[PDB]
Write a protein that binds this ligand. Structure first.
Ligand code: MG
Lengths: 80, 44
């Protein structure tokens, strides 16, 4: 029911991405199933995902592109 | 030394106290894994 409520949640904030949020969240748990077999405690697994996320959000803000682009808009048509 | 003083009767309370301790320690074993920062959550 967590991913069921997560897919219903994604519509509330952004409104799009319900397909990508479920696949990523299911894969984070899938690969973590072999990490607990290593005896690694989840707090080490959770910290490893959070420290990598803090650097991931900052990396996305560095690689973003401005909406200016060329003279004309050429954005909102491609956004849809 | 034997055969004198008194002899214990109705020894079932001795087993009842053991059955109460064993059943109480079994409950304390499930919550024991949640102790400390390395503890885990329990979903019910
Ligand atoms: Mg979409």
């Amino acid at each position: 029911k967590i991913l069921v409520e997560l897919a219903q949640q994604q519509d509330r904030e952004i409104g799009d991405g319900t397909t990508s949020v479920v696949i990523i969240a299911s894969e984070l748990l899938k690969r973590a199933n072999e990490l607990v077999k290593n005896k690694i405690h989840p707090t080490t697994i959770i910290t490893g995902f959070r420290v990598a996320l803090r650097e991931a959000i900052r990396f996305i803000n560095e690689v973003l592109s401005t909406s200016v682009d060329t003279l004309g808009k050429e954005t909102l048509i491609n956004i849809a | 030394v034997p055969s004198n003083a008194t002899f214990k009767n109705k020894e079932k309370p001795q087993e009842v106290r053991k059955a109460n301790i064993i059943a109480a320690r079994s409950v304390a074993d499930a919550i024991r894994t949640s102790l400390g920062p390395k503890g885990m959550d329990k979903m019910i």
